[PDB]
Design a protein around this ligand. Structure first.
Ligand SMILES: [K+]
Ligand SMILES: [Mg+2]
Ligand SMILES: [Mg+2]
Ligand SMILES: [Mg+2]
Ligand SMILES: [Mg+2]
Ligand SMILES: [Mg+2]
Ligand SMILES: [Mg+2]
Ligand SMILES: [Mg+2]
Ligand SMILES: [Mg+2]
Ligand SMILES: [Mg+2]
Ligand SMILES: [Mg+2]
Ligand SMILES: [Mg+2]
Ligand SMILES: [Mg+2]
Ligand SMILES: [Mg+2]
Ligand SMILES: [Mg+2]
Ligand SMILES: [Mg+2]
Ligand SMILES: [Mg+2]
Ligand SMILES: [Mg+2]
Ligand SMILES: [Mg+2]
Ligand SMILES: [Mg+2]
Ligand SMILES: [Mg+2]
Ligand SMILES: [Mg+2]
Ligand SMILES: [Mg+2]
Ligand SMILES: [Mg+2]
Ligand SMILES: [Mg+2]
Ligand SMILES: [Mg+2]
Ligand SMILES: [Mg+2]
Lengths: 205, 129, 156, 7, 123, 79
RNA sequence: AUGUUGAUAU
RNA sequence: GCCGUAAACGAUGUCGACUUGGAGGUUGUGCCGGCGUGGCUUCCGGAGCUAACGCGUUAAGUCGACCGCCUGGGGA
RNA sequence: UACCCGCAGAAGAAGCACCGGCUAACUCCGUGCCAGCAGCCGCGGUAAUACGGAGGGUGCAAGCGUUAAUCGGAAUUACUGGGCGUAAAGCGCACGCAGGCGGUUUGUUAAGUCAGAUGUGAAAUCCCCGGGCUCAACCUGGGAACUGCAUCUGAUACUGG
RNA sequence: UUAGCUAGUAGGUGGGGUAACGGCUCACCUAGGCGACGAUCCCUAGCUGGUCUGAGAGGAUGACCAGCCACACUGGAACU
């Protein structure tokens, strides 16, 4: 129930940085980011409509580290909830605690943030939550626990967060090591690279 | 034999429009005239007129706009072989409200718009669009 | 400016004394994305030239669709040959719910939200023709008001 | 026949 | 059909038919091999395809295919059959399950091992 | 008002009983056409007034015989 | 006047 | 007297209404060789329809009523 | 017992199917219409992306495949929503009982039809807005819904009498 | 590719019977009653809320949960 394999070959397949390394150095220096993985990597075959849709869904999944069953449930939810289904889906994925812990800047990667949550180093409005998929709601404080504040992982991550673009929907304090989930991110707040309608098509077919 | 004079009127209009006829003349009846009013008031036909006593003849004057005939379609709905009656909540919107359904309600023949407003259902005579 | 889309490439054959002469057909659609759409069908011995021929024909044979805020005015039925298409206006954020041939016509035409179904033959050429036949004979309130000799709010 | 052709 | 005709005689649905009637809506059935033999496929194929006539627990006699390279079935071998025709053996509507009951798994198989009843190589 | 049905008399041969056909008229559940659907009732006719042809009003009551749980109210029309 | 046939797969 | 079937065919059910034309054939009739007006019929063809071929006021067009019939090839 | 606290150490914890097209994923070797594959089309006859293995890859993941079974796609029984010159389909032709359908005007009736009201349509389930289990599944508050049925009272255009 | 079925049968009168209406039963009378709107006969089947699928209309289904029915080795009978 997690991908434990090599992280860059995921990125190389998608042909795009999925932030599965910390960003201490460029992805270009760590791998051949241009080339897809394996023997027939340099080959770039003509991709079908299904293949385009698939690769888009697999991109978004691989960023947030969601496996297919759980991802499909998010789609079903996003479709159920009112509004545009595609932007609903990305909202649900941003709402995940392991993502929120990454976005604030406590994990270097989302898999590190997932290790933080998993290992009972995170609190949400006081209480310890060790579920990666937990939906962090608006006006919720997320916090490092006092034993976990001494970790070098958290401080080092908080430095990398400054180099990254700041989420407008999160207000964080690096000193106290806690941040508010102010509001649900709009589609504008999230990246324009993700083509959510392709994912909607993929599950709508 | 002749067993649906309404379908016959609709067909005379449909055919007459296709044949770029100025006017179409059928044998008259109260219900035909009632429909002719709704088609006049909604602006599908131009005018009508009954003429005669023993055998009255209805005479619809047909409309054409920019060359084309105004009645795009005109479909019998309720027919002798299968009567269609709808409640007020289930009245049909023809062409998303851009066309009419002619409805015989307890308060006379009228559009489905007028029937919705009057809070009545009834027999769905035809669609026009 | 124009969204060009390739729907179908097909290999076709005439027989001669020598044997079979193969050639390529390309079916394309072009549109502005604001209710102007045209299909083109081009034949050549090579696929590129068939496509280039299809695109050139498509640009010269565009028609005007009277759209309503990125969806249809009303339900429409198109027919061509064995293709019977049905298309219905949808709510915002529906997307195009359509098969691949109809999808391409509707995307380039500028229909964002629509429920479509192709009944009968799903032959790409005839489906495209039935769809565009549908779109071009879709009435707006304004032209309905015009023909009936009323105002738009009398109609609506 | 010929126990099974065209030459 | 007129409405009055349908009122008098409604639409009958296409009845539909099993391609695996001897299973009697069961995922598998057991049986006993009466004959184990080879047979030649129809055109355009050529082979000696390994089949067995089988008497099922429910009394039906069927031919079943034995898939994979090599098998250990003789007459009076107890085997498990499942649905699945062999396209180029007319009459063969079932496959034997390799590695169920007396039918062995395929020797020295490495890929699609679950399909051929082969336990995982010890690595 | 008291609940009554109305129907034609189809048999009067029983002593102090009639058979009454209640003609209903029903939209067909599938095909939408309106269909005549009879329902016959054995009906108590004390005095033996009614004959075949007559329209009659009838009301439900206690069982009177094996087949009768309906009584004559009035003859609406005669033949 | 008559005047047969052309193995299998590809 | 029986049989009860045929590529028993227009491979096109019956009845009714409506919808540009042209050239004939046949059989009435009215008005004065012409000018109408009915019936039945052959060929062409327009819109429309049709997968196409074609059909096209004697529709396979546009409609209504009722009936008959079809539901992959074989097995039949 | 849930839960909390402490300890030690990455320690105790990844497979299954697939990669000719449909369908995301390709090469080498072996085999040589054999052995075998196959949902459908098909593949294998000595240079096999289709067999078998390997390397690489794709998809799912404590599951993954296969088989069985239902609906869908199938407007392929077509009420919504199909056909019948030649594709399957007009009885060989008629008369005609039951049945279906019925020109036009007025009155009347109120069966169909329509309108309103009332009663009923168990709870659960589904759906919506909330709440509670760290989350979720799950549990649960209130609603909506239950498209129906009956009764009563009106309407009278249309259909019936 | 089941067209006729039915003599307590259908109705009446009176007596008996049941907690209760009733051919529930009996005697007598009448000759009815059911059926192409499918009786009778044959096969299959517990029914429903629902469930699965479906855009819907439908199609399929009735395991768990809840309502109703039926049965308790087989056949029959009453007693309390
Ligand atoms: K010979
Ligand atoms: Mg799981
Ligand atoms: Mg088709
Ligand atoms: Mg020859
Ligand atoms: Mg015959
Ligand atoms: Mg014939
Ligand atoms: Mg012609
Ligand atoms: Mg591919
Ligand atoms: Mg080789
Ligand atoms: Mg299946
Ligand atoms: Mg269907
Ligand atoms: Mg068909
Ligand atoms: Mg033939
Ligand atoms: Mg034929
Ligand atoms: Mg005939
Ligand atoms: Mg006759
Ligand atoms: Mg009438
Ligand atoms: Mg009434
Ligand atoms: Mg909660
Ligand atoms: Mg509730
Ligand atoms: Mg309820
Ligand atoms: Mg009347
Ligand atoms: Mg007595
Ligand atoms: Mg009784
Ligand atoms: Mg049973
Ligand atoms: Mg459907
Ligand atoms: Mg059932």
């Amino acid at each position: 129930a997690r991908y434990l394999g090599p992280k860059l070959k995921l990125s190389r397949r998608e042909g795009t940085d999925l932030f599965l390394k910390s960003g201490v150095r460029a992805i270009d220096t760590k791998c051949k980011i241009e080339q897809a993985p394996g023997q027939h990597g340099a080959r770039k075959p003509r991709l079908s409509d299904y293949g385009v849709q698939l690769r888009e869904k697999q991109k978004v999944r691989r960023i947030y580290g969601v496996l297919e069953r759980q991802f499909r449930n998010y789609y079903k939810e996003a479709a159920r909830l009112k509004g545009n289904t595609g932007e609903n889906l990305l909202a649900l994925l941003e709402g995940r605690l392991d993502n929120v812990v990454y976005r604030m800047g406590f994990g270097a990667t989302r898999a590190e943030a997932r290790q933080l949550v998993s290992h009972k180093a995170i609190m949400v409005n006081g209480r310890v939550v060790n579920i990666a998929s937990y939906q962090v709601s608006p006006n919720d404080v997320v916090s490092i626990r006092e034993k976990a504040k001494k970790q070098s992982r958290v401080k080092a991550a908080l430095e990398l967060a400054e180099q990254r673009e700041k989420p407008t929907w999160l207000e964080v304090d690096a000193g106290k090591m806690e941040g508010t989930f102010k509001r649900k991110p709009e589609r504008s707040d999230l990246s324009a690279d993700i083509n959510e309608h392709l994912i909607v098509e993929l599950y709508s077919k | 034999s002749m067993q649906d004079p309404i379908a016959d009127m609709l067909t005379r209009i449909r055919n007459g429009q296709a044949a770029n006829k100025a006017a179409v003349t059928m044998p008259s009846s109260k219900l035909k005239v009632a429909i002719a009013n709704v088609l006049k008031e909604e602006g599908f036909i131009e005018d009508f007129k009954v003429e005669g006593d023993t055998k009255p003849e209805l005479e619809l004057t047909l409309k054409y706009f920019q060359g084309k005939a105004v009645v795009e379609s005109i479909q019998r709905v309720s027919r002798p072989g299968l009567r269609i009656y709808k409640r007020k909540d289930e009245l049909p919107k023809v062409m998303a409200g851009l066309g009419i359904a002619v409805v015989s309600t307890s308060k006379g023949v009228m559009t489905d718009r007028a029937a919705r407003q009057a809070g009545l259902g009834g027999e769905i005579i035809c669609y026009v669009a | 400016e124009l969204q060009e889309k390739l729907i179908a490439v097909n290999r076709v054959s005439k027989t001669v004394k020598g044997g079979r002469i193969f050639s390529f057909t390309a079916l394309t659609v072009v549109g502005d994305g604001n209710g102007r759409v045209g299909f083109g069908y081009g034949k050549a011995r090579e696929v590129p030239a068939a496509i280039q021929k299809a695109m050139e024909k498509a640009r010269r044979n565009m028609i005007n669709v009277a759209l309503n805020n990125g969806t249809l005015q009303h339900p429409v039925k198109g027919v061509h040959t064995g293709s019977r298409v049905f298309m219905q206006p949808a709510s915002e954020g529906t997307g195009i719910i359509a098969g691949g041939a109809m999808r391409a016509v509707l995307e380039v035409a500028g229909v964002h939200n629509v429920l479509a179904k192709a009944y009968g033959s799903t032959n790409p050429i005839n489906v495209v023709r039935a769809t565009i036949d549908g779109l071009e004979n879709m009435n707006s309130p304004e032209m309905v008001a015009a023909k009936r000799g009323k105002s738009v709010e009398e109609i609506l | 026949x010929x126990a099974x052709x065209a030459g | 059909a007129t409405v009055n005709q349908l009122v008098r005689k409604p639409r009958a649905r296409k009845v539909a038919k099993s391609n695996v009637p001897a299973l009697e809506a069961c995922p598998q059935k057991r049986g006993v091999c009466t004959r184990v033999y080879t047979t030649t496929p129809k055109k355009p194929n050529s082979a000696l395809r390994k089949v067995c006539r089988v008497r099922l627990t429910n009394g039906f006699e069927v031919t079943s295919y034995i898939g994979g390279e090599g098998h250990n079935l003789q007459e009076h071998s107890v085997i498990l059959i499942r649905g699945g025709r062999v396209k180029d053996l007319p009459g063969v509507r079932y496959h034997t399950v390799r590695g169920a009951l007396d039918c062995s798994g395929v020797k020295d198989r490495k890929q699609a091992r679950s399909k051929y009843g082969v336990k995982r190589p010890k690595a | 008002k008291i609940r009554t049905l109305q129907g034609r008399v189809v048999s009067d041969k029983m002593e102090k009983s009639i058979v009454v056909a209640i003609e209903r008229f029903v939209k067909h559940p599938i095909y939408g056409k309106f269909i005549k659907r009879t329902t016959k009732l054995h009906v108590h006719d004390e005095n033996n007034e009614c004959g075949i042809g007559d329209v009659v009003e009838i009301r439900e009551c206690r069982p009177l015989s094996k087949t009768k749980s309906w009584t004559l109210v009035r003859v609406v029309e005669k033949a």
